[PDB]
Amino acid sequence: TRRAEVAGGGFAGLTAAIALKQNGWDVRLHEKSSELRAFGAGIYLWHNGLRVLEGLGALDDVLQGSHTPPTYETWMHNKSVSKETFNGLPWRIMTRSHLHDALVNRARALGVDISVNSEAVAADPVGRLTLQTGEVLEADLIVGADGVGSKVRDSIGFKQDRWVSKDGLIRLIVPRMKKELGHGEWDNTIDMWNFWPRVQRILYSPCNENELYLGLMAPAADPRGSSVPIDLEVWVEMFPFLEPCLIEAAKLKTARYDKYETTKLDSWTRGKVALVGDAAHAMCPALAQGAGCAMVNAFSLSQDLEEGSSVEDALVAWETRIRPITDRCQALSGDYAANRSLSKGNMFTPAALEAARYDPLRRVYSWPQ
């Protein structure tokens, strides 16, 4: 029986663990934190990621308690500039805890061995994983799913193109306060852009009937807009129609202003070691495909490992097959981010929706645009 060691309990790590377990691997997943949990408030999932969930046997628990807006609307200075529904292309909004729990319950039901307070500090291409305590573990496959700053990746050494965003945002989960919002289309996803009187943007995303996912974006150089707890006055001023929700957001003393970095590597494999998720391809958040590609890649890895070839050969075949979809998505997302293309509306074109249209289960592209 083949054994796999997965470093990282994030969406990519859980996806890989479950996919491998389903194919008969003995699997152990290592999470450095003392508890299994996800940060980031909310998250968007598209057709490609929803298919992975179906392939993992975790779709049902995710759909129940999640939300699909009637439309994805964009505003520029409070003027609606577009409403797109992606020609039937499936998508869903949910809190990260909701998605994380579905994956963790599924992993537990399958018998995946989860170790907390277990931090991987090094990986050997020959099939060895070293923990922070010094303990060395041997396996037939090592999966590096430890996010940005990946110690597994850095212990082997990959050529890396790195970039860091000077500006960030505050992501929060607050009550819907739907009735207090009054007249409007408050079940819609609404990306509210503003450049005047100042640069402030809010991504409004309902997760279900009780929770609302908000993304408050302001320049790092803005002392008021980027502060946490949020500076209520400055947000209500440019988004008065959301005052009821903003009032609730101002009470979250745990809010944080997060920035991000992007990563592109020369390769994702080395011997029996495979890198997945952020550790391998963190990207700009514009297309909301970070977790989507991560899960597709983690799931595809388990597929290529079922061809009867050696793990080393399976890994390079995996990257050759699946990598182009991620590279292209990462690049386009990079362009959108830099040029603030989403502020124009109608930007979810066929090209931008390429990764979302991919169906990892049948390995073909669906929902034509």
Ligand X SMILES: Cc1cc2nc3c(=O)[nH]c(=O)nc-3n(C[C@H](O)[C@H](O)[C@H](O)COP(=O)(O)OP(=O)(O)OC[C@H]3O[C@@H](n4cnc5c(N)ncnc54)[C@H](O)[C@@H]3O)c2cc1C
Question: Min. distance of Cβ 278 from ligand X in angstroms?
Answer: 4
Alpha carbon 348 to chain centroid distance? 18
Question: Min. distance of Cβ 151 from ligand X in angstroms?
Answer: 4
Say which residue the tokens 């109608």 belong to.
346
Question: Min. distance of Cβ 290 from ligand X in angstroms?
Answer: 2
Q: Is the peptide bond before 70 cis (omega within 30 degrees of 0)?
A: no
Which of 167, 243 has the CB closer to ligand X? 167
For residues 230 and 163, the answer to whether their CB atoms sit within 8 Å is no
Which of 29, 244 has the CB closer to ligand X? 29
Which of 145, 238 has the CB closer to ligand X? 145
Element (H, E) at 299: helix 290-304
290-304 vs 47-56: helix crossing angle, rounded to 10: 40
Which pair of structure tokens corresponds to residue 302? 């388990």
Question: Min. distance of Cβ 291 from ligand X in angstroms?
Answer: 3
Question: Min. distance of Cβ 177 from ligand X in angstroms?
Answer: 22
Which of 115, 309 has the CB closer to ligand X? 115
For residues 193 and 75, the answer to whether their CB atoms sit within 8 Å is yes
Binding residues for ligand X, rule: CB under 6 A, are 7-13, 30-33, 40, 43-44, 119-120, 145-147, 151, 169, 260, 277-278, 285, 288-292, 294
Which of 1, 135 has the CB closer to ligand X? 135
